Amino acid sequence: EDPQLLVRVRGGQLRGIRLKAPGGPVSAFLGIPFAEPPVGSRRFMPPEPKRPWSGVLDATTFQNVCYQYVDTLYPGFEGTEMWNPNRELSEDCLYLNVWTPYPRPASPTPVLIWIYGGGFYSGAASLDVYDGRFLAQVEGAVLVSMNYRVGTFGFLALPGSREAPGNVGLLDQRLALQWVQENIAAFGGDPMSVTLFGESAGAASVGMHILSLPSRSLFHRAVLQSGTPNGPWATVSAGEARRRATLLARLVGCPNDTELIACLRTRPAQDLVDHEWHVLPQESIFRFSFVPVVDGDFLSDTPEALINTGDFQDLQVLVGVVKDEGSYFLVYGVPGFSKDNESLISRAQFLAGVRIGVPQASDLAAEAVVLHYTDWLHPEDPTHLRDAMSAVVGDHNVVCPVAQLAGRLAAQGARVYAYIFEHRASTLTWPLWMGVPHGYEIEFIFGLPLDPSLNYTTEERIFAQRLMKYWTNFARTGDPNDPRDSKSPQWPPYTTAAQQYVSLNLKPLEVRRGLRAQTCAFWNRFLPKLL
Amino acid sequence: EGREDPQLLVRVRGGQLRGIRLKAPGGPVSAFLGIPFAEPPVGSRRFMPPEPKRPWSGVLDATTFQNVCYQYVDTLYPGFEGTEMWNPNRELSEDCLYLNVWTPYPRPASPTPVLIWIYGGGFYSGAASLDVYDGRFLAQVEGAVLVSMNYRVGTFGFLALPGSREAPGNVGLLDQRLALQWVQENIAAFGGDPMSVTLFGESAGAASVGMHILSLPSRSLFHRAVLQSGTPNGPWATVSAGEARRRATLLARLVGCPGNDTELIACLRTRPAQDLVDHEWHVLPQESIFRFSFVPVVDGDFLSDTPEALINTGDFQDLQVLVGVVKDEGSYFLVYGVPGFSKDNESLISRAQFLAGVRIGVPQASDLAAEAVVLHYTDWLHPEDPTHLRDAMSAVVGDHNVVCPVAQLAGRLAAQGARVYAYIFEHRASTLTWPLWMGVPHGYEIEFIFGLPLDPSLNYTTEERIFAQRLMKYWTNFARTGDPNDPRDSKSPQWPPYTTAAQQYVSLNLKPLEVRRGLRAQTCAFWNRFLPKLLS
Ligand SMILES: *[C@@H]1O[C@H](CO[C@@H]2O[C@@H](C)[C@@H](O)[C@@H](O)[C@@H]2O)[C@@H](O)[C@H](O)[C@H]1NC(C)=O
Numbered sequence A: 001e002d003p004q005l006l007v008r009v010r011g012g013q014l015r016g017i018r019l020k021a022p023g024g025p026v027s028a029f030l031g032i033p034f035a036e037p038p039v040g041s042r043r044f045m046p047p048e049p050k051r052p053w054s055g056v057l058d059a060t061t062f063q064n065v066c067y068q069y070v071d072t073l074y075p076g077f078e079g080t081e082m083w084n085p086n087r088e089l090s091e092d093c094l095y096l097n098v099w100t101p102y103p104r105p106a107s108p109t110p111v112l113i114w115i116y117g118g119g120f121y122s123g124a125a126s127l128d129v130y131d132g133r134f135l136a137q138v139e140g141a142v143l144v145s146m147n148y149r150v151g152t153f154g155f156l157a158l159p160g161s162r163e164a165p166g167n168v169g170l171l172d173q174r175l176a177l178q179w180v181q182e183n184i185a186a187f188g189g190d191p192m193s194v195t196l197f198g199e200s201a202g203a204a205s206v207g208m209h210i211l212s213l214p215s216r217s218l219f220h221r222a223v224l225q226s227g228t229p230n231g232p233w234a235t236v237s238a239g240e241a242r243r244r245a246t247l248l249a250r251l252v253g254c255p256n257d258t259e260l261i262a263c264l265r266t267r268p269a270q271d272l273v274d275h276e277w278h279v280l281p282q283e284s285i286f287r288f289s290f291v292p293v294v295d296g297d298f299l300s301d302t303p304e305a306l307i308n309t310g311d312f313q314d315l316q317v318l319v320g321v322v323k324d325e326g327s328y329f330l331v332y333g334v335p336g337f338s339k340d341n342e343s344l345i346s347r348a349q350f351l352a353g354v355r356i357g358v359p360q361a362s363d364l365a366a367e368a369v370v371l372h373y374t375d376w377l378h379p380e381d382p383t384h385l386r387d388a389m390s391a392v393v394g395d396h397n398v399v400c401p402v403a404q405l406a407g408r409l410a411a412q413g414a415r416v417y418a419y420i421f422e423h424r425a426s427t428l429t430w431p432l433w434m435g436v437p438h439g440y441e442i443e444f445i446f447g448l449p450l451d452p453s454l455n456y457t458t459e460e461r462i463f464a465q466r467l468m469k470y471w472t473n474f475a476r477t478g479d480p481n482d483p484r485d486s487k488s489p490q491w492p493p494y495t496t497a498a499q500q501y502v503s504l505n506l507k508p509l510e511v512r513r514g515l516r517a518q519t520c521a522f523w524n525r526f527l528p529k530l531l
Numbered sequence B: 001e002g003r004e005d006p007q008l009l010v011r012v013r014g015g016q017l018r019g020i021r022l023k024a025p026g027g028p029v030s031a032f033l034g035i036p037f038a039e040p041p042v043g044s045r046r047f048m049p050p051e052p053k054r055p056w057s058g059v060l061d062a063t064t065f066q067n068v069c070y071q072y073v074d075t076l077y078p079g080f081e082g083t084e085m086w087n088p089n090r091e092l093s094e095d096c097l098y099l100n101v102w103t104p105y106p107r108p109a110s111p112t113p114v115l116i117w118i119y120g121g122g123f124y125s126g127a128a129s130l131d132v133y134d135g136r137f138l139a140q141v142e143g144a145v146l147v148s149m150n151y152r153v154g155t156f157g158f159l160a161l162p163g164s165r166e167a168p169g170n171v172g173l174l175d176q177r178l179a180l181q182w183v184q185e186n187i188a189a190f191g192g193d194p195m196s197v198t199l200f201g202e203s204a205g206a207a208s209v210g211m212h213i214l215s216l217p218s219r220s221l222f223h224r225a226v227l228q229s230g231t232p233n234g235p236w237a238t239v240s241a242g243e244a245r246r247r248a249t250l251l252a253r254l255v256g257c258p259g260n261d262t263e264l265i266a267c268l269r270t271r272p273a274q275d276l277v278d279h280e281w282h283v284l285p286q287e288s289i290f291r292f293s294f295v296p297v298v299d300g301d302f303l304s305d306t307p308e309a310l311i312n313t314g315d316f317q318d319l320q321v322l323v324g325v326v327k328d329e330g331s332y333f334l335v336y337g338v339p340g341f342s343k344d345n346e347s348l349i350s351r352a353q354f355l356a357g358v359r360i361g362v363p364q365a366s367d368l369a370a371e372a373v374v375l376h377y378t379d380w381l382h383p384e385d386p387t388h389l390r391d392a393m394s395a396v397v398g399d400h401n402v403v404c405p406v407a408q409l410a411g412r413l414a415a416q417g418a419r420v421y422a423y424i425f426e427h428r429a430s431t432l433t434w435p436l437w438m439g440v441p442h443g444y445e446i447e448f449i450f451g452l453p454l455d456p457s458l459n460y461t462t463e464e465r466i467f468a469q470r471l472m473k474y475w476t477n478f479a480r481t482g483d484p485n486d487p488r489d490s491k492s493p494q495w496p497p498y499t500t501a502a503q504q505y506v507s508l509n510l511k512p513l514e515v516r517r518g519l520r521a522q523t524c525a526f527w528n529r530f531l532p533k534l535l536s
């Protein structure tokens, strides 16, 4: 019984496990319950704090993955399998994980809290790309990651109802943040220094905690990787949530709110997942059925309204995108695209793809998009058309919403740092045409290249170390730059005036200005006016 | 006769003419100036199509320029070279239908290709007698036979009551057509070849050339065409019959007339010419720039349909066309109407002034289309930079009115089978009197095409002189063969045809030809494809 692996938290005692990291051991406490299992009558309901337990709780293995749709697009393909559940599915899934250096930190260490992505319909804190041992061992960080309900279980809502109020998956996240405040000191973490970081829907989640008052006292800084609370897919109005929920109910034979929800609660979990995707209003990509809802509660107004009118002084934020945000979503629904060929498309296929990629666009807006993205020197060139299709999806869903958030936060007094991640992993299994896809900067931030057995190059290992440094320096001080390192160059804050951001790749930081400025003016200023 | 120069006496359909021997830097040239080609369109002939000139007896003196067609005179900058070089340099009169001919001296031995110049001036001004249109250099150096005619402008040439008998519209275009017929019948007497006639013109002149290309009866009067900074399609070169009627009747009211067409026109004909000129600008529907009151009207006659419809569905095989723009088409128009601009300061404007400028420069734009323009032209890295805003205002005006209409025309002509050559003129005359911020303004390539730099007394640089000669070569080679390239000289890079596929065009400046691709392709897609669809 190694005393370093024995911790007492408010609920009782835990036993962690010593894990081996390339440069030394780390302590891991996996599968710690932070809420009462949200099963039976608790389905769709806000999470309740976990009741205390007797004895020593075994926290040596990852707990179950929240019930969710499983990808079958490319069966057995590492590219899609690396994101699939790697533990049993269960509605009993509200657990969190803590990695700490071994022996545990002598003095209070800044805490990083990871919130995974997966379109609000999938994901798990147990995936290998979210392994916190490297950041714990190399940077001496205390890293926490929690499971939160996704799909219908975490976001199906009948606004105004008592039994399915919406946003419970965000409340799962909040409860875990509350747990860190109350317990992290026992692991040597500093509850006075908590940094949230997440990617895609995880980044959007982080943004929603920034925009929801009760969450604000639970953290101090934030990192939003390729996702934002504002934008076309991260939220739905109360009316559209209600619509989707009642339509899903009908598809599974159900049934007044109470009765509808009571009947939904009797349905096996897989039945809900089976009809999840049938409620979207149009054929599309980068759109998800059950996501956070503007309820007038967790979200007092639309993210747009809240970022425009919020005061963000005393908040530091790191935001960024990867070089090809859209490619990944194309094989998932646009005729002509595949991971197995060059995906050279026709102009006809391009016009078709735009309707799918910008599903809420009127015919006129769609033509505006086509005309803005067509390269008039080579209007028929398949290579340009394929790349332009990717750019349209990535700009509309991630890049422009990120530029928008970055600008409003800076204007509203926040300290902001922005980046574009441009390195494609040597180990990437998707075709070259997809470039640096959505989600592929994560393995570098978590430091996986430091694992010899993974076969990353020596340069990639040096690169990962650089990133871990930027992220942990940011967690420690709200500034990603090295406090004792001259000869850099420096990563300057992003401002509405100069709009500076940096490129993250194998070469030294390079400062650029204007994040897709002309194109985002099109998405952020003109298309809306084409109301 | 008997005692004068035997080499200056010529006979044309209407009678005998006596020209004058003019000195050109490299030798003498023959000039026949002020040849009448129509009956004076005065009195009951005002607003009416021109009638052929009745024969005269004796020898008509053709040694001096004739009157300039009655027109508005520019006062923006009194005594300023920049605006004065374009103002009438002979007496204003409604009796102004005369043309001029320059030919080598002695006259050419064998039939020489003819160049016919059609001046610009927004269809409300201009004259074939201006110094920048002097044909002596092209005549002397390239051995060209050059012809230029006066045509009615403003109300006299374009006021119309569509359908009426007394003001059918487009009579200024009919004045030009009559001069083209005069050339067919008479140019051989000067040594010119009626089988080889090339029309060239700038701004409204270029638009005019384009309308002759789109009008059947004019097609048999020429073989090749050059359109410099102007097109028949576009936002300012034509108005619908309804808009012409509206403007004509509003003008009639402003001068106290008259009801029915006959009476209204009969009353307008009693008005002093100056009163019509004094009110012509008062009929435009919005505060604007690059918009002219009385211009060609889509009458269903001279213009069977809109130039747009005609270029989209026309067959242009066997047509060779040279087309181009200068580097800063819009700058000239900003000092004539956009608050914040002046020829006397750097015209650094505010974002507010830019937004107001856009409404004036794109007068037909709805609020939404105007915002689309502002968003497209704003540099989002430096949205408040005054230098960028000033330059973007210029580009907005130039692209909307000249550059994109030219891109559109070049593309449809090529697709419809025409052989097209395209250029962008980028050299600013060392003698330019406009401020530097204006760059290479609309109209400032003309003095080079005509070879004025060859005149020692004008103070152009030695490089400008060689440059002028190159341009004259391109234009006359094109007139001679339908190809600007020198049949010999394989050395100099070649000027390739413009095609929808490659979209090639060349840069004309002091350096050797450089081929570029896509004439403002991205921006012109906005003006030519998107703005129209924003038709709702
Ligand atoms: C540039 O000039 C514009 C026109 O104003 C006139 O010309 C200038 C040079 C002065 O002489 C002025 O007194 C004249 O009325 C102005 O509207 C514009 O604001 C000026 N821009 C400057 C100098 O900032």
Ligand SMILES: *[C@@H]1O[C@H](CO)[C@@H](O)[C@H](O)[C@H]1NC(C)=O
Binding pocket: A335, A336, A337, A338, A340, A341, A342, A343, A344, A345
């Ligand atoms: C690429 O693969 C997909 C799926 O097999 C196919 O539909 C498409 O036609 C292929 N060809 C292309 C677009 O390059």
